[PDB]
Amino acid sequence: TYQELLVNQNPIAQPLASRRLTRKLYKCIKKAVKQKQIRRGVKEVQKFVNKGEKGIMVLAGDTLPIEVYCHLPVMCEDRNLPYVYIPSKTDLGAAAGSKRPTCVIMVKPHEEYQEAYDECLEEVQSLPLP
Template sequence: MTGEINPKAYPMADDSLTKTIFELVTQASNYKQLRKGANEATKTLNRGLSELIILAGDAEPLEILLHLPLLCEDKNVPYVFVGSKQGLGRACGVSRPVIACSVLQKDGSQLAPEINKLRQSVEKLLI
């Protein structure tokens, strides 16, 4: 059962950006720089730990994570929607679907340049 992508899911990453996002999420998971789930993503935003928020455009109902873009805008954190919660779950390294995840900042992280590059691509979508 796959959910339809909700038109409210904006900005939506295209296929090549989605692939890049999933690769980064997988690496962030390996480096312990990832929090999975809408609640965890909300906590990292509130605590100012978040570099980037990735949301699933096929979450049912989408409203369960629509507070996140507002919070991201308040905290100046870029966010992006990807097409599939199943794909996001796999990228996070779990077998369950994941509707939201947060990539964390970490001083001296080897992922920093990649996170910054992805942040810039995501910010371009928001303009």
Template sequence: MDTEDINPKAYPLADAALTKTILDLVQQAANYKQLRKGANEATKTLNRGISELIILSADAEPIEILLHLPLLCEDKNVPYVFVKSKQALGRACGVSRPVIAASITVKEGSQLKPQIDNLRSNIEKLLV
């Protein structure tokens, strides 16, 4: 997948290193049952105020199907980030299908909290 194929609307886009960190965290979140997959589920977690972080895939076709999420994230003050590949996001979510959006959810006493906070601050740096 070339950079040329990436939709300019997919902003902020994580670079390779950050993508790896994000996908690792998604994988852990899936193990800890702190993950919701799909644009609809991600929307629900935002509306319910239980989302820590939204991960979107830049190669969703058409990308408009998930562009309501960044607006909602900004509304709810939840960081969001794009990764290049829905296939990779799907794999990290532990499913064989491509996943265009995922939400890492809030959980009391979660062991992932430090990683989530660390990632949030990295994503906030992208937006500056």
């Protein structure tokens, strides 16, 4: 199933998360949404990256056109924030308990899922960079 979504990826969607890492990130988002510790829009994520709030920024790799969110990767690299792509925008929205898609989510750290957050954070920073 995963390999079918890999057709729909962007030119700029790297580093793409591994199939198991994608699953870890969704489970971390579900816990963060329950705790009220995420940001969802480009409108939102852009605002709190500017303020300097830390978090793992998860991006949808099938977002088109790329102009809507392609500024965000460099905004993270300016502030050394960890970011990663995942196969689809619909699943990223579905992870946050929504029927409508979204192209980006930023997961904030919190005590209730601190171990799961650190497990995701560790693997995100370890990814090979293009």
